[PDB]
Amino acid sequence: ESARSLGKGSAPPGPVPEGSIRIYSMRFAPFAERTRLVLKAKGIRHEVININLKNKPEWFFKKNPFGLVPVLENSQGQLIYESAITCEYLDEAYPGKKLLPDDPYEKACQKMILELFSKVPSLVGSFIRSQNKEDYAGLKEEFRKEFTKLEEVLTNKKTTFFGGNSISMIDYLIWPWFERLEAMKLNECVDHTPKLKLWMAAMKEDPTVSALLTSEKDWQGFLELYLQNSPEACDYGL
Amino acid sequence: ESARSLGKGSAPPGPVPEGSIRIYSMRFAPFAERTRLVLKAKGIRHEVININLKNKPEWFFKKNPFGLVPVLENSQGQLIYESAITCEYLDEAYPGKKLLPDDPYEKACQKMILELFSKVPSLVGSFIRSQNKEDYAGLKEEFRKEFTKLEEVLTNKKTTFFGGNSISMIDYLIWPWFERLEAMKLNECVDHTPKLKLWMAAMKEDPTVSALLTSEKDWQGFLELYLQNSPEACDYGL
Ligand SMILES: N[C@@H](CCC(=O)N[C@@H](CSSC[C@H](NC(=O)CC[C@H](N)C(=O)O)C(=O)NCC(=O)O)C(=O)NCC(=O)O)C(=O)O
Ligand SMILES: N[C@@H](CCC(=O)N[C@@H](CSSC[C@H](NC(=O)CC[C@H](N)C(=O)O)C(=O)NCC(=O)O)C(=O)NCC(=O)O)C(=O)O
Ligand SMILES: N[C@@H](CCC(=O)N[C@@H](CSCC(=O)c1ccc([N+](=O)[O-])cc1)C(=O)NCC(=O)O)C(=O)O
Ligand SMILES: N[C@@H](CCC(=O)N[C@@H](CSCC(=O)c1ccc([N+](=O)[O-])cc1)C(=O)NCC(=O)O)C(=O)O
């Protein structure tokens, strides 16, 4: 119940309490899942306000003039948005093991892999609107090209994850789009990419990933409503 | 003469000497100017290899598989690309005053302003191909919308530059597209944005900006050839 989204007409929320940080999110948004994975991995005390993205509160544009999730707001009232920016902010502003490497080159490398990956979210957007078996074959091809590039990174590095043999920031940043791959009927696109397939399996075993994983059933329920343009999609299940 | 670009058929360059870093650049490329402004501002010893982007050396794709400038290569053979990534790398890997703030929020802010600005390079690409007075009026409008957003940042901050009252990373990252504004006949788009106009004037007074500024005459010579699709554009003037 408490997870229900805030939409048009809702009262603006109060101040974030000292000792917590707040994320404005939506339970099915992969960009916000990045930020939540980082919050979870670093053990950062936080609250979540879900936003009805189909019927947004007017006040939400005071949080982010772009009107998008994720957004962080801290107890000092500071606002941070763009998922990758929010993630690096958390890594720097909070204690515990650092998800990004301290080494400048290794850090730059993670950011270059993110750029390599950056076509995938737009492709997923397109697959979700694919109309027939002809479109779907073409989509499968574009994903295959993209996935072969990621395979090459793992091949060159000889490690299970993209930043080393332990999970790190870059893995959490790309994960949410792979999470949805099964549902979108694109789990055959990883057939030519064996290291990437192993990576997926290893990601699903990570405690932070597992804790935040959404079931096939729930994602499908959301997708059905989202594509029906329903103002209740964001609250699928409740 | 030494600044002449390397193109198809050129021998791959040798190793970068210990104590220097190398930038693969092109004298008229605004994305590479970012990196050169940072090299200059931090006093970093470096060499430049200009790339003929119309007729690229095959070996350049071993430096950057995307085939784009800028690219950094250091004496250890490490390769970094994407202009913003190269700039942050230099700020972290070399001594001297830091162009990016140490504070996580203030740093995240610079990155958010960069995202705010990020439509402008694609617009400049479009203006350069604008065909008549009707297209040009429409372009002027899109720039005006974008420039009003940047004006708002300076208004909210009450400082001459985008990261404070002293020049910092964010200013150097956005400067190269404003440098070209005069030439593109878009210097009237800043009429409604007075703080942004003052910013331009202050940028031109910066020693690092001034040292790297290209004259109206030379940019025009390059543009003329670039749009004529000439393999000699990159070496305009020599
Ligand atoms: N560069 C930004 C992008 C952030 C972004 O796009 N956020 C989305 C979160 S939903 S994540 C991205 C996108 N989903 C959406 O755009 C949802 C749109 C909303 N439901 C509406 O009603 O308009 C998507 O492709 N999901 C994959 C899938 O459906 O399987 C958002 O808030 N959109 C609101 C809007 O566009 O107005 C970042 O990295 O943070
Ligand atoms: N995201 C990357 C973008 C880098 C990028 O686009 N680099 C350009 C440098 S030229 S800077 C960007 C672009 N110029 C060009 O694309 C030049 C293309 C080349 N001359 C050719 O022959 O294809 C531009 O719009 N300039 C404004 C102007 O002309 O006034 C490049 O190497 N292009 C090679 C290519 O596309 O194949 C980054 O930030 O580094
Ligand atoms: N619109 C802009 C592009 C916006 C953009 O690309 N942002 C970066 C992320 S913002 C940069 C940053 O500061 C950062 C912080 C942390 C990490 N990291 O943790 O690895 C990496 C980069 C990115 O790689 N976007 C692609 C994506 O987010 O999928 C344009 O048209 O040019
Ligand atoms: N293709 C991608 C977008 C690529 C991208 O947006 N890169 C960042 C820059 S890369 C992030 C980063 O790590 C960084 C490093 C330094 C600074 N800074 O010094 O301020 C900021 C961000 C950016 O803001 N691009 C916009 C631009 O470069 O104009 C996509 O489709 O999503």
Author numbering:
A (entry chain A), B (entry chain A): 4 to 241
Give the published text.
In this report, we have describe a crystal structure in which GSSG is observed in the active site of an inactive hGSTO1-1 mutant (C32A), giving us a snapshot of enzyme regeneration occurring. Our attempt to determine the structure of hGSTO1-1 in complex with 4NPG has revealed GSSG bound in the active site and 4NPG bound at the dimer interface. The likely source of GSSG is the non-enzymatic reaction of 4NPG with residual GSH in the crystallization mixture. The GSSG dimer binds with one half of the molecule in the G-site, with interactions the same as those observed for reduced glutathione binding. The other half of the GSSG dimer extends upwards into the H-site and is less well ordered. The binding of GSSG is associated with the structural rearrangement of several amino acid side chains relative to the previously published complex with glutathione. H-site residue Y229 has shifted to accommodate the γ-glutamyl residue and the indole group of W222 has rotated 180°. 4NPG binds in the dimer interface, deep within the cleft formed between monomers. The 4NPG-binding site is largely hydrophobic, lined by residues from helix α3 (A87, I88, C90, E91), the following loop (L103), helix α4 (Q113, K114, L117) and helix α6 (M172, I173, L176).
The inducible phase II enzymes known as glutathione transferases (GSTs; E.C. 2.5.1.18) conjugate endogenous and xenobiotic toxins with electrophilic centers to glutathione (γ-glu-cys-gly, GSH). Like all cystosolic GSTs, the omega-class isozymes have an N-terminal thioredoxin-like domain and a unique helical C-terminal domain. The omega-class isozymes instead have a cysteine residue (C32 in hGSTO1 and O2) in the active site that is oxidized through the formation of an enzyme-GSH mixed disulfide with the concomitant reduction of a co-substrate. Thus the omega class isozymes function as thiol transferases/reductases.
